[PDB]
């Protein structure tokens, strides 16, 4: 009867309903065939388009310049947590700020070609458990 309790009850009920919402994937959903709203054309789905392209950022030329000479191997990628991008040419590695681009970091530590790089979480209990992330870099000879 009291409005205040009443309102609370309504929200709670609705909250419950929101939580109950059906599971995303079920075999039954598209057992016959998938419903698709599929246009070949960009912005073909006018109102509905799930994604839009907000912006394009080119690799900074300053970064590119230190990638100019690469005999052996190239590779690049984005680190999801960092919101930074990395470029590997031969031995050297660059990390550049997604948002900035001017800001870039360079590894001079590695002597040899860099086979692979990866971002990983630290162990539960080591001296560096505190650090947010670890950067693993593998070259032919060593893993740093």
């Amino acid at each position: 009867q009291e409005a205040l309790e009443n309102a609370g009850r309504l929200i709670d009920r609705q909250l419950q309903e929101d939580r109950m919402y059906p599971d995303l994937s079920e075999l039954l959903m598209v057992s016959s065939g998938m419903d698709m709203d599929y246009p070949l054309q960009l912005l073909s789905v006018p109102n509905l388009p799930e994604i839009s392209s907000i912006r394009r950022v080119p690799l900074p030329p300053e970064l590119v310049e230190q990638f100019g000479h690469m005999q052996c191997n190239c590779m690049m990628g984005v680190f999801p947590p960092i919101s930074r991008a990395w470029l590997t040419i031969d031995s050297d590695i660059f990390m550049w700020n997604y948002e900035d681009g001017g800001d870039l970091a360079y590894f001079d530590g590695l002597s040899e070609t860099i086979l692979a790089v990866g971002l990983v979480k630290p162990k539960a209990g080591i001296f560096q458990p505190h650090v947010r992330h670890l950067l693993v870099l593998a070259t032919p000879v060593d893993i740093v």
Partner: protein, 120 residues
């Protein structure tokens, strides 16, 4: 709305405090945060579309926002001595900014003497 412009004015002011008194790098970061000036790509034009929309108070302030950018951008990007040096960024930023300034000079006081700072 009223509060929003208020915060923007404060942000711009903190940018001032740190602009000069060194802290070149910090100034760019803050200016970009303002989301007024195109740091990204040629999105400079979107910055045109969103310009006229701007409230009267900000519309007036932009002149200094530009040129502050081309300054820090200049000084920070003093050609260095003798490795990863991405000069390219903080360079593209000037470019986008200039296109921006190029598009609205008429709707600005009339000092595209960004050019003087721009070159050397």
């Amino acid at each position: 709305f009223v509060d929003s412009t208020f915060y923007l004015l404060l942000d711009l002011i903190t940018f001032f405090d740190e602009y000069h008194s060194g802290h070149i790098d910090r100034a760019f970061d803050i200016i970009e945060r303002l989301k007024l000036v195109p740091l990204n790509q040629e999105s400079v034009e979107e910055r045109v579309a969103a310009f006229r929309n701007f409230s009267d108070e900000i519309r007036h302030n932009l002149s200094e926002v530009l040129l502050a950018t081309m300054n820090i951008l200049f000084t920070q990007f003093k050609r260095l001595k003798g490795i990863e040096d991405r000069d390219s960024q903080l360079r593209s930023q000037a470019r986008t900014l200039i296109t921006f300034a190029g598009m609205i000079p008429y709707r600005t006081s009339g000092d595209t003497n960004a050019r003087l700072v721009q070159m050397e």
